[PDB]
């Protein structure tokens, strides 16, 4: 068809849901990292005889 | 010498404990080297062999991506145990030497 230009197909609902899910997943992974680090910090005293 | 035969077992046990302590500390130090295998010795068999070293690979527990099989918890417990047994061997050897001494003092 002549006289019409096609735009993008970026769905905003999908983008918003993806951002929410990404933020929540990032926070969960940061919490896991903190837990593991604290556990190793507590565990690295056994070596004291 | 007869004096060596009495103190041979404890001296060999003490030396083997020191060697295994060095091996465990090497395992701890190289924890971050990718591709490093955790090595250890079987204390009883080597003690038989010396009284009458070969390094054995540790069986990995968790598969890492960089090929490092060193586990923190297992070797930390083994390190503490080896330290305790080294102290016990020192205590036993010192007691034997002190007894041999008080036999002579007079």
Q: Of B5, B39, B13, which Cα lies nearest the Cα of B92?
A: B13
Residues B47 and B13: beta-carbon distance below 8 Å: yes
- As separate numbers, helices (DSSP H) first and strands (DSSP E) second, chain A gives 1, 0
Phi, psi of B39 (to 5 degrees): -110, 155
Nearest-neighbour CA in chain B from A46: distance (Å): 7
Tally Cβ neighbours within 10 Å of residue B100.
12
Residues B20 and B47: beta-carbon distance below 8 Å: no
Helix (H), strand (E) at residue B57:
strand B56-57
Phi, psi of A18 (to 5 degrees): -65, -40
Q: Of B53, B42, B35, which Cα lies nearest the Cα of B78?
A: B42
Technique behind the model: cryo-EM
In this complex, how many residue pairs, one in chain A and one in chain B, have their CB atoms less than 8 Å apart?
17
Distance CA B63, CA B34 (A): 12
Q: Which residues contact B40 (CB under 8 A, 6 or more apart)?
A: B20, B23, B24, B27, B55, B56, B57, B58, B78
Q: Is the CB of B76 less than 8 angstroms away from the CB of A43?
A: yes
């Amino acid at each position: 068809m002549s006289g019409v230009l096609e735009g993008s197909n970026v769905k905003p609902v999908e983008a918003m849901t993806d951002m929410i899910a990404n933020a929540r997943r990032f926070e969960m992974q940061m919490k896991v990292i903190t837990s593991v680090d604290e556990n190793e910090g507590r565990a690295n005293q056994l070596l004291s005889m | 010498d007869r004096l060596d035969a009495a103190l041979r077992f404890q001296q060999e046990a003490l030396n083997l404990r020191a060697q295994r302590q060095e091996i465990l500390a090497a395992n701890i130090a190289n924890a971050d080297t990718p591709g490093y295998q955790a090595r250890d010795i079987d204390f009883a068999s080597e003690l038989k062999k010396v009284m009458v070293v070969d390094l054995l690979y540790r069986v990995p527990d968790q598969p890492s991506l960089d090929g490092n099989t060193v586990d923190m918890d297992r070797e930390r417990t083994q390190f503490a145990d080896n330290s305790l047994k080294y102290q016990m061997g020192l205590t036993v050897l010192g007691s034997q030497l002190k007894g041999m001494m008080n036999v002579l003092q007079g």
